[PDB]
């Protein structure tokens, strides 16, 4: 059982490296889904205001 529970430990040890890529993925995803679309929506206003 010491060796069996160690399987869970190495899984967590790797899951940490998975979530490290998840942050980076979520960051780029927010640039494409939030930051850039909002910047486009703001330009419409500056044009239709004229």
């Amino acid at each position: 059982r010491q060796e069996e529970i160690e399987i869970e430990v190495v899984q967590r040890k790797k899951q940490i490296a998975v979530e490290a890529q998840e942050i980076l993925r979520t960051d780029k995803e927010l640039i494409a889904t939030v930051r850039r679309p909002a910047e486009a929506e703001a330009h419409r206003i500056q044009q239709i205001a004229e």
Partner: protein
């Protein structure tokens, strides 16, 4: 003559019954002592299990 024999019979029967009672119960005593050592290690697994958790 009967009495002389009857008393020795009863006297020897005390010892035979005494020694038989000891031998009869001698097994379970060791079973308890052996389990005493076993249980220590059965729950020792819990300590090691928790330590990895």
């Amino acid at each position: 003559a009967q009495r002389d024999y009857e008393l020795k019979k009863a006297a020897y029967d005390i010892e035979v019954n005494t020694r038989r009672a000891q031998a009869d119960l001698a097994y379970q005593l060791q079973v308890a002592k052996t389990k005493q050592q076993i249980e220590e290690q059965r729950v020792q697994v819990q300590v090691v299990e928790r330590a990895q958790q």
